[model samples]
Target: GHMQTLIFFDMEATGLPSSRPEVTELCLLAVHRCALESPPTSQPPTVPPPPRVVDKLSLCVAPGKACSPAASEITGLSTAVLAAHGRQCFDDNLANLLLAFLRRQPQPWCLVAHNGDRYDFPLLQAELAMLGLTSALDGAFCVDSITALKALEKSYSLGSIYTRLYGQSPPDSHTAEGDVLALLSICQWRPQALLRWVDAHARPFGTIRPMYGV
Candidate 1:
């Protein structure tokens, strides 16, 4: 139903070294902007506010099969946190929520999770496999802003890069929701620039997230 679509995503993991790091949080923002009105509605086609967040999924997930210490440092949530309110509650909820998120889309959608291709997506997929469940990434467009931003041309970290591009610091650098809104704001504020950047730096190679899981 829409041509020009943008999904900016991010993830917070237990660590950053493994394909599995015991993901603590997962978040994605799916955005599509289209000229809905023909020409003008009396005065003009009101510039539709970028679509409201159609879906959001956040949960306390199982930490790890063999916990990584660096992972603990990165997320600041100990095994205790995971044991207390981790996969015990959301193991089933995760697969169900993810299935619900994708079942409605007509076109192939994306999971735009920052640094997800590496940690978040893999860990979650492993978790699902452990439970014999499936996630949206197996056959959906995945966009990674990390690769999109730093491909040697515009090489910089997330916060500094954001500040340089937009004159501000990206908040909640490791929080799921924080990354989603931050990414969406960038797209909304400067669609053309972000698009050009993506085209120049990162675009989908296949249905899988080899870069970092969009």
Candidate 2:
């Protein structure tokens, strides 16, 4: 099998699909397939750590809209707070920064997001469309880790699965960067299974439409 750069991605939004949420925070953690591979050992480490060699990109978006009180409580991000911190709305500059980060990684790129097909991927596409850069990531592939994990695990929530596998709660659960780290840890723990899932279930990035159509 060809080596892949798996980018574990996560986003914190203003609210759920019903509320028409906007992204407040976006994070990507890129790891090479080789780094994720379990080394041949007499006894594998009981708790595997995430790869040391990885790239991370985390950005906060102001969204120019109000975050629902429910979401604000969970993610701790509000338009006012973001603005006070000098975060900008999703725009051309931010899009370029995101694209640049993706371009810096080794290919072929496969974006892995939990519940991505239902949320992250589509919402990200929507944001890119707003900047007229919907096709920028055309050649990349995407895999919904939630769907892939369904065949292997009884619990699918990131926190639940992480706790089940490692016997502890994932730290900083609702934050994008923290969630990305949690996903990375899971991928590192079960690289072979995830790689197989990627092979069987990966989808072309261009194939996804926004959650709410443009």
Candidate 3:
């Protein structure tokens, strides 16, 4: 609860670059990374401050339209299923709820997600843009764990990194909550590399970019 909230987040959306792909699921794990202690001799002096998560918010949403055939297979959210089980918040209410969740912590929080530069963060911006609230995340910083983890390990994909670091495959994948949990684990284990990456890439909200070409 000290410096900033490590909001490990993930989202599931319809196919990319489509007409109006929308967020079908979202998850956030707000971790408070403080100066827990000095890094062990094995760690470099530039390691990110160790922090623990203090809050979580998750949701399933209706995408307003049908999912792409491939998207439904990945996210398990289709117009048919949404009719039966999706939460009722449209884009407007969903943005409102997410902003409330962000505010529940403190200002200038850090948003972390896998491949967020290409997928999650931009999609969130698209959603926020729909509601004319693009600045809702202003002053907050965003960290793309994909790039951050790439610096510490060879394979930056969530499952591969999880297995390499923890010696086992992640229990779940693709789903927002599951991905967020794995992302959090990855962050907790590699704080040093993450710190360095954050220093370089963590810009004000809406400024995160893909380090490799888009």
Candidate 4:
């Protein structure tokens, strides 16, 4: 089977799972499979090579519900702030926009996300189903970076993983776009390992169950 495009995806929500969070922000960073294949070399470059091809999609969504105080503190996004910024809700239009963005990239898209199996993937599916857009992402795949990185890192937190690999805290830690970029950096740091993990563990998007029952 051919390797799929890796789209490092992330989201910031109104609150945690206990609180039934709604997404406040979303981001996707698409990197071609070729960018992740290792070159034949005894010693690969210490610094990751700049990806030859990439695409990004970032959006802010106004959750009609208020953000939890803790969530607002961490993500710096609240319903009031979103309203003031004139952000749109996650609806059919936004879902279509996201699907369109995925479609523009090379086929066989695989969304890579930290803690996605428990959080981002199911949550996004819930949102999609809310608008009858569940089928929109039917053919895509998902790879949970946290699951793969657990074998290699002491802590699976995105910041901890980034710092351990690069010796610096990831910038803009809690925002969706920032987190996506940090995940991208981690992939770039060891492209082959991450790509191999994707190949092994990636699951079809259609298999994900929403975080909550509809």
- Candidate achieving the largest TM-score: 2
Candidate lDDT values, in order? 0.53, 0.83, 0.71, 0.84
RMSD of 3: 5.6
Q: Against the hidden reference, what TM-scores do the models get?
A: 0.67, 0.92, 0.81, 0.91
State the lDDT of candidate 2 residue by residue for 99-189, as single tens digits.
8888888788999999999889999998888778879899789989888778756668888888888888878657899888888877767
- After superposing candidate 4 on the true structure, give the runs of residues whose Cα lies further than 4 Å from its correct spot: 38-52
Model 1's alpha-carbon lDDT is: 0.53
> What lDDT score is found at residue 181 in candidate 1?
72
Tens digits of per-residue lDDT for model 1, 36-104:
212123432212243543545555566545346776676665667678763553366767776676565
TM-score quality measure for candidate 1: 0.67
Candidate 3's displacement at residue 7, Å, is 0.6
Q: Candidate 4's residue-wise lDDT over 26-105, tens digit each?
A: 99999888877844344454445557567988899999799999899999889999999999899888987897898898
> Which 10 residues in a row give candidate 4 its minimum summed lDDT?
38-47
**Over all chains combined, what TM-score does candidate 4 have?**
0.91
Clashing pairs in 3: 31-53, 33-51, 47-192
Candidate 3 off by > 4 Å: 1-3, 35-53, 208-214
Show pairs that collide, candidate 2: none
